[PDB]
Write an enzyme that holds these catalytic residues in place. Structure first.
Site, PDB file in Angstrom:
ATOM      1  CD  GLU A   1      -2.343   2.295   2.816  1.00 34.26           C
ATOM      2  OE1 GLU A   1      -3.108   2.281   1.830  1.00 34.26           O
ATOM      3  OE2 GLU A   1      -1.183   2.761   2.759  1.00 34.26           O
TER       4      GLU A   1
ATOM      5  CE  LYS B   1      -0.752  -1.357  -1.943  1.00 30.59           C
ATOM      6  NZ  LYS B   1      -0.567   0.093  -1.663  1.00 30.59           N
TER       7      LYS B   1
ATOM      8  CB  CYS C   1      -3.487   1.653  -1.364  1.00 31.43           C
ATOM      9  SG  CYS C   1      -3.156   3.428  -1.159  1.00 31.43           S
TER      10      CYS C   1
END
Length: 491
Positions: A263, A324, A370
């Site tokens: 990430e 995301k 995540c």
């Protein structure tokens, strides 16, 4: 004295709740997950609503205090907090999150049936347990931590995980725990004892038989994976230091198919990285590999404003840029900012639901950034119509303790739930490959600057959980909660 109000029963629920971490992250002693729920079911037996809310609160205080104890490390190290202040902040979170178990225990006291308890109630507690776990995953941003079902990843119910997800594992554990409590008031009646044993033993026999079953076809010849992690911690001057480091570890690699960067591996936005990412694509092309890396993606609005996203993009042998979808409440944004931002005296925005998957090497890959992995219903939609699973995450925010290990157990479950291989690329925390059965085949040591080499097989076919998602089980639970609701209403 366990089921009668007052402190003696309250403090039992603390230790009963505190057995949640033991069934889960490194320890993985699954029988303890049954004790926790059984002691809570027996602890709630005779209580009125006034004291049953507090038993559930004392159980959630013990579960979230011991299970999420990794949160204290986050407050202390990365929150710049002193020991008494960090003990207070962690104590404030634990006491608030403990109401996820307080509300259903209070509502249980108003749906609870002791008279016909032997069978109807055991079924009703499983339905109540599935209902509070589903409630945890959505209510504000959701807090899908410490589900009972993750205990069985390596246990006997691992055959039911592809059938019903972590939901069905939690349902069987809650049903089996409540049935044991009702068992000694069963045996005098032969008919109810036999039915109680089919409800107790039935799912465990079905789980062992279905263990390791391949629900998913083999989709082709395996892709050789290379994962790079690096120990960047709290670091704009060092942008060029990161770009050099990730490139310099990729260039010597050969015989590669997928190269995966965690990430925000490239700290600059992809607008300013267009020359760097194109140069890395050419490096990937001559290796005949795709470079899958996380980057912030900025969207220029019609005004003088910008919309920032937490992305993952693919250059060289693959295409697509994924944003995301679901974010962390105070880490990546401010909830109710017109109110709480005046009291906070923080960056990103939410991604679309109509997004496609990431195509690489011809196969489809379902991205997860995540902890989007911890949401079982959200991940199942991406995992379906996807050949390979990939999660790109930064685990430095959790800490040095249990955060990545609990989070990794949830990532293995998603692979077991979809029957898909998962490529987990983390900045510091556990980086590895997970087979369709939830097993960790390859992992590099955490908190170090490593490289992971492996092979994943793309997976075809489908898993029963990916076909019928939690609806059939949640439907059965609603019926079991009605018969308990109407059974008390009729008396």
């Amino acid at each position: 004295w366990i089921s009668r109000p007052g402190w003696p029963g309250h403090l039992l629920a603390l230790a009963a709740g505190a057995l949640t971490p033991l069934a889960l992250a490194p320890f993985d002693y699954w029988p303890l997950a049954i004790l926790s729920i059984a002691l809570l079911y027996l602890g709630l037996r005779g209580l009125p609503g006034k004291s049953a809310l507090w038993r559930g609160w004392w159980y959630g205080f013990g579960a979230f205090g011991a299970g999420t104890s990794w949160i204290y490390v986050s407050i202390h190290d990365y929150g710049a907090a002193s020991v008494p202040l960090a003990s207070l902040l962690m104590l404030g979170f634990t006491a608030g999150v403990a109401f996820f178990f307080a509300l259903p225990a209070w509502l249980w006291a108003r749906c609870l049936r002791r008279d016909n308890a032997p069978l109807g109630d055991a079924l009703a507690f499983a339905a109540l347990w599935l209902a509070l776990e589903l409630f945890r995953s959505w209510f504000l941003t959701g807090f899908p931590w410490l589900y009972a079902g993750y205990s069985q990843l390596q246990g006997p119910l691992a055959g039911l995980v592809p059938v019903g997800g972590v939901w069905l594992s939690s349902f069987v554990i809650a049903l089996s725990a409540a049935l044991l409590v009702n068992l000694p008031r069963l045996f005098p009646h032969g008919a109810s004892l036999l039915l109680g044993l089919v409800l107790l033993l039935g799912p465990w026999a079905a789980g062992l038989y279905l263990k390791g079953h391949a629900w998913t076809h083999s989709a082709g010849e395996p892709l050789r994976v290379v994962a790079i992690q690096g120990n960047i911690a709290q670091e704009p001057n060092q942008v060029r230091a990161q770009l050099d480091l990730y490139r310099d570890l990729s260039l010597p690699q050969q015989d590669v198919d997928l190269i995966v960067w965690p990430e925000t591996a490239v700290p600059i936005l992809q607008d300013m990285a267009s020359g760097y990412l194109g140069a890395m694509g050419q490096v990937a092309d001559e290796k005949n590999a795709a470079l899958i890396t996380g980057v912030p993606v900025r969207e220029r609005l019609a005004d003088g404003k910008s919309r920032y996203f937490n992305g993952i993009t693919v250059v060289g042998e693959g295409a697509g840029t994924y944003l995301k979808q679901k974010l962390v409440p105070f880490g990546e944004y401010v909830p109710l900012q017109d109110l709480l931002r005046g009291l906070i005296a923080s960056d990103f925005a939410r991604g679309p639901a109509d997004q496609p998957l990431l195509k690489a090497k011809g196969y489809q890959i379902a991205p997860y950034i995540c902890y989007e992995v911890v949401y079982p219903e959200f991940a199942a939609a991406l995992a379906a119509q996807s050949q390979v699973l990939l999660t790109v995450s930064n685990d430095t925010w959790f800490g040095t303790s249990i955060g990545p290990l609990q989070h990794l157990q949830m990532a293995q479950m998603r692979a077991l739930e979809s029957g898909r291989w998962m490529i987990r690329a983390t900045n510091n925390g556990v980086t590895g490959l997970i087979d369709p059965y939830g097993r960790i085949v390859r992992q590099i040591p955490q908190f170090q600057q490593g490289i992971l080499r492996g092979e994943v097989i793309p997976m075809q076919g489908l898993t029963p959980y990916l076909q019928y998602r939690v609806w059939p089980l949640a439907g059965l639970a609603g019926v079991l909660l009605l018969w308990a609701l109407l059974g008390r209403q009729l008396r």
